[PDB]
């Protein structure tokens, strides 16, 4: 399914090229610009564990999740991944623990040393 397709065909968007964040675009955005570090970004997401089980979604609060890009307000994989997205884009990200919650996890929802899958939609971005 989708996570195995990211494993097998995803683009490595990390600077080190350690496969820490792999990406597949699912829906093109509009406009060619991506957010700059420091921009406010507005996302919907669905997050699944390696066995396919949901661990979280913005839709659980029925509102977009809002954060400042590149400030470490989110896991590393999001600061990297969202920066690559255009407004309106939907992508799939597979995120190794080093770029997510590491050996600590976020228990019980996220186990130790968990590779995470996200489907993320970049709804909007705005400058600071």
Whether 99 sits among the annotated catalytic residues: the reply is: no
Residue among 49, 44, 94 at smallest CA distance from 65:
44
Which entry of 42, 65, 99, 101 is annotated as an active-site residue?
101
39 three-class SS: coil
- Catalytic site includes residue 24: no
75 noted as active-site residue: yes
Which of the following is catalytic: 13, 24, 75, 110?
75
Surface-to-core class of residue 27, CB atoms within 10 Å of its CB (0-12 exposed, 13-18 middle, 19+ buried):
exposed
* Identified catalytic residue from 56, 67, 90, 124: 56
- The answer to whether residue 55 is catalytic is yes
Q: Which of 55, 67, 90, 124 is catalytic?
A: 55
Q: Would you name the residues annotated as active-site residues?
A: 45, 55-56, 75, 101, 118
């Amino acid at each position: 399914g989708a996570p195995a397709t990211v494993t097998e065909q995803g683009e490595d968007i990390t600077s080190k090229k350690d496969r820490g964040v792999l990406k597949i675009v699912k829906r093109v955005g509009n406009g060619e610009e991506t957010p700059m570090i420091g921009d406010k970004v507005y996302v919907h997401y669905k997050g699944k564990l390696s066995n396919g089980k949901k661990f979280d979604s913005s839709h659980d609060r029925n509102e977009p999740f809002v954060f400042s890009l590149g400030k470490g307000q989110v896991i590393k994989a999001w600061d990297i991944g969202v920066a690559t997205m255009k407004k309106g884009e939907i992508c799939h990200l597979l995120c190794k623990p080093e770029y997510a919650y590491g050996s600590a996890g976020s228990l019980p929802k996220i186990p130790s040393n968990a590779t995470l899958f996200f489907e993320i939609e970049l709804l909007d971005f705005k400058g600071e």
